[PDB]
């Protein structure tokens, strides 16, 4: 259980590093899909089975499908902005690298001082999540439906062809 957790975490970190440093949009999206499968592995190793199921169903099966769809629609290939590799020049990324580094080490040092009895990996079933979703969190469900409807209307209005 734990070994799968560390292996999938390492795979997700390496895949994310490949996404943020790649030049092909399709290869970057494929590496992101690999990272999302790894993150679903993290979800399954902790007992949150519903979380990993929805990670592969709607995150690694719907949203990145939409990204791949718009990539093949836009015909992204040998463009001018892609050929120069401006994000790989060290003078460009050296500032954001140390910025993300100091943010990361501050967050790490804040995390490391917290109490921890460990995660038992007890499987929180999707039945309990369904009970709580329509239990204490009913207005979250209705207004998240309203949020998805708002995003639907906004993206339709922006994304028409006319």
């Amino acid at each position: 259980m734990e070994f799968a957790f560390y292996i999938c975490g390492l795979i997700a970190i390496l895949a994310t590093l490949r996404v943020i440093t790649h030049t092909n949009p399709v290869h970057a999206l494929l590496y992101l899909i690999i990272s999302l499968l790894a993150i679903s592995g993290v979800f399954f190793s902790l007992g949150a089975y519903f979380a990993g199921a929805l990670e592969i169903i709607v995150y690694a099966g719907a949203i990145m499908v939409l990204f791949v769809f718009v990539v093949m629609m836009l015909n992204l290939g040998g463009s001018e902005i892609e050929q120069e590799r401006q994000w790989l020049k060290p003078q460009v990324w050296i500032g954001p690298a140390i910025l993300s580094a100091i943010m990361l080490v501050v967050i790490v040092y804040a995390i490391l001082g917290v109490n921890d009895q460990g995660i038992d990996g007890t499987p929180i079933s999707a039945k309990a999540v369904g009970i709580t979703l329509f239990g204490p969190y009913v207005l979250a469900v209705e207004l998240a439906s309203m949020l998805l409807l708002a995003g639907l209307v906004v993206a339709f209005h922006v994304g028409r062809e006319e």
Binding site: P96, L99, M103, A110
Partner: protein, 55 residues
């Protein structure tokens, strides 16, 4: 010597300081989205580090 009103200039000092500081602060609003995200992350590090050093 006094006909140029030196005390009026000594009290007009903060007006020119305010204009210079405002023109300097307007350099951050260059209209670049990547700089805006970078400034948000810079503020995140500043706020975080200030919270841990004063914890």
């Amino acid at each position: 010597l006094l006909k140029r009103d030196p005390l009026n200039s000594m009290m007009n000092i903060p007006a020119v300081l305010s204009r210079f500081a405002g023109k300097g602060l307007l350099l951050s609003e260059n209209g670049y989205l990547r700089w805006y995200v970078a400034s948000m992350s810079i503020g995140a590090v500043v706020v975080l580090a200030l919270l841990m050093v004063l914890r």
